[PDB]
């Protein structure tokens, strides 16, 4: 499934998975690891999940997302998201912690907001594969968060929305 | 937004909202009422949705789905579910209640499975709009369970998956 990786991506992504997304975790915290292929060049992919501005266009359960206009987004901005009815949130406000274009990183702390979930920070990378004439993208997403399934399910389905639209740009 | 009817489909849909999704509910119970705009054809959303044998051609979350073969699926016929990892649920066996093909009215009860609901029922109803040349759906789709935000959010992706299937077809 485009959900699960094959032995080999898993192999390839040993270092990565380490790096960004293993968690030595306190008695009071969980985490949870989410991949996704993407059938799409990986600098198209990550062209648009770095968009901290307009995460609208790349997740799910977004109303509207409110930053400062007339800057670039850089590491220290926040966002102010309102959350579309019916979910165990209302509002969020979130930092952008990493943006690296060069390795294809990046993440966000939610700092507040109205909503239940205390600590959660994740981290995204975007991997390029290759074989043959044939390049592809595999994006894992992980989280942290003090304490699981319901955001496991909008973490697989942002992901999911991630490559339907870079899928959808690369048609030829 | 493509879930949330305007005026003027909300008044036109005023008598099937009370014939097929509105709830006298006892304390113990609980519905919910979803909406998802669908340009297409009616006739089109009905030939996906009325398929009761391939739930996982227009929902989300199902790893396989069982059903017995060589039979053209009925009023009272089920399938067996198997749920994907990661869910509060790992099978769901169902039952086919309403399969009406002149009116476009379809649904389901949870009968038997492992998973945290008791006396799911649902119901889909396909509804054709017209304005100048312009004919598009709306799909409605209601449930009542025993004792809600996670059966919410499985019904408006599943919505939206049906949504996105339909107008690839229709594309010209
Ligand atoms: O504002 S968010 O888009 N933040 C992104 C986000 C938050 C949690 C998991 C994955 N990704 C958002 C969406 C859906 C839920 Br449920 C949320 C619940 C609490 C806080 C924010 C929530
Ligand atoms: O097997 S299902 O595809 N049934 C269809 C269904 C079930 C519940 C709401 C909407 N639609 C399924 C999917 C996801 C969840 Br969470 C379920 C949890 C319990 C039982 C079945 C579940």
Known sequence: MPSELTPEERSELKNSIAEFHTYQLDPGSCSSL??????????????????????????????SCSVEQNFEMRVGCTRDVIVISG?????????????????????????????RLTNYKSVTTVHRFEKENRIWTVVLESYVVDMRMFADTVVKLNLQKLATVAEAMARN
Chains 1, 2 share one sequence.
Request: aromatic share 8%; no cysteine.
């Open 34 to 63: 989410h991949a996704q292929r993407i059938h799409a060049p990986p600098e198209l992919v990550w062209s648009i999940v770095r968009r901290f501005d307009k995460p609208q266009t790349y997740k799910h359960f977004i109303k």
């Open 87 to 115: 979910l165990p949130a209302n509002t969020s406000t979130e930092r952008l912690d990493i943006l690296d274009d060069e390795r294809r990183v990046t993440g966000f702390s939610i700092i507040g907001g109205e909503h």
